[PDB]
Design a protein around this ligand. Sequence first.
Ligand SMILES: CNC(=O)c1cnc(C)s1
Ligand SMILES: [Zn+2]
Ligand SMILES: [Zn+2]
Length: 582
Amino acid sequence: NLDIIGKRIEKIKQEHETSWHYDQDHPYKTWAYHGSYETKQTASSMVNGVVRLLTKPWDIIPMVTQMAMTFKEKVDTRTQEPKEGTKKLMKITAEWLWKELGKKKTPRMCTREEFTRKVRSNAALGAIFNKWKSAREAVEDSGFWELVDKERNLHLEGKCETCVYNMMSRAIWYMWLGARFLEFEALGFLNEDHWFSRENSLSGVEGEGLHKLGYILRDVSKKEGGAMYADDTAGWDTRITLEDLKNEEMVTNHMEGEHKKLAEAIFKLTYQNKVVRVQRPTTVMDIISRRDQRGSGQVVTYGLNTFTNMEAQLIRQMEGEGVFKSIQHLTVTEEIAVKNWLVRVGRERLSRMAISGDDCVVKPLDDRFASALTALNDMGKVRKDIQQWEPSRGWNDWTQVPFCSHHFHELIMKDGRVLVVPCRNQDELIGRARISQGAGWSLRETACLGKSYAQMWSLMYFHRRDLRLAANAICSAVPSHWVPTSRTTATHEWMTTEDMLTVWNRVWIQENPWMEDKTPVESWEEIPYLGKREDQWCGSLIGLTSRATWAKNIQTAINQVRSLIGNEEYTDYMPSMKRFRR
Ligand SMILES: CNC(=O)c1cnc(C)s1
Ligand SMILES: [Zn+2]
Ligand SMILES: [Zn+2]
């Protein structure tokens, strides 16, 4: 308790000595409260005018237009301690899983150079504003690194002074760049060296790309077994127990020297003990603390969520297969059975799963898995939108399974070759491309973000009639040499000024390990669409009068945007489509 968090609390107390009151009407039950102090401040979603002017039919579709307008009583709940049997299953599984992930990888510190290079090409590191303006400036200043140095030596000494969370079914925990650096130095290797690649972790999909996920789910479907299960957890980050954080910390057992000590400090001082500052309109700042739940950087959060989800799903698989009888207590002979199961079939069972942080697909040995709920519920990983003891409903067809906000279609090219393509409701895709985040966007920067969405659509969603047409229109409306941009950056192959037909050939043919015939495609007309009825099912406006008028008059929309941007060099991409080709 206060021996580990006091120093952080003490330091904040003194910087607001004018305002420090132990408020009596504090709304916290599950968070430890410590005091308040005076502040006054808040970043709404802005519309992308280039994308909206080229998607006129969607101006009267509420599912699109409502997306641009506008639970923290789930962060303030508690999770019960798992039973002894459950704690044993988790410890055995976690020990085995770090060893498997460690067989072909070496833990190592990430460098100031790697961190500096990240900041100097806009990765969402979740930092705050203040002594330097931006991340780019602090990183190019020796003073910062001396603050970093002071904290670093405090961590080597087993103590913390400045590693404090700022809070803002979501919740992002920003830290100061320094605390983020020290987290990246100790634990960045999990992402930087691809510990959760499919090659390394067998269940993972880190670095795979949306053009691979469908083929991965089809490969899982080919295993003998029961239905495909895709159960969502209700508020995964809030269900991470102190036992989970201790099993995650066992990655330090594989480390040595300075690295081991720096990593043990991140786990002990920032993950297993947290200090957080939260805005309350009653506007004050509350300084609250707790031991459990997930609150790390978003990239470390991804890897540790993937780890703990892989662990939880192996245990649910063990329950279904009858490897243990009860979570109350593991007998000596059940422990050896669980160890033996892991050694003999553990790697096969990992290959039955696709796991992306809190998101999973499992094809178990049989459907006993559906009603194997005791360990899953006792670990606190309670399923969303189903009663606690109601058996899971599985999917009979891999093309219906939800994963990473998508489903996947099997699409046969006129030449017989097979594409497995990503898909989601088209209102969601159009609504997202019509939104920007943040202030000070020039017309050029707005155009270049629209171009990033257009090129993503050409590469991932070419099979949706409306998106191939809208992508061609946006790429015709934005100057040909202007470079696509994002502000918060899976593999992003559409972020390029290379010709999109050349990129399509590289991604779907040349580098596609599921495509045996490497014959390049010569034009966009060789590249197929979904069935017309399937395209409508997934939200196409094909068949509507609004959509017909838009398609017919598209050159008028393109010319409106070109007139706003001004006298620049543009390319007409519309004749790449049969209907504009004379
Ligand atoms: C006596 N039970 C066991 O040792 C195992 C159960 N399932 C395995 C693959 S090994
Ligand atoms: Zn610290
Ligand atoms: Zn679809």
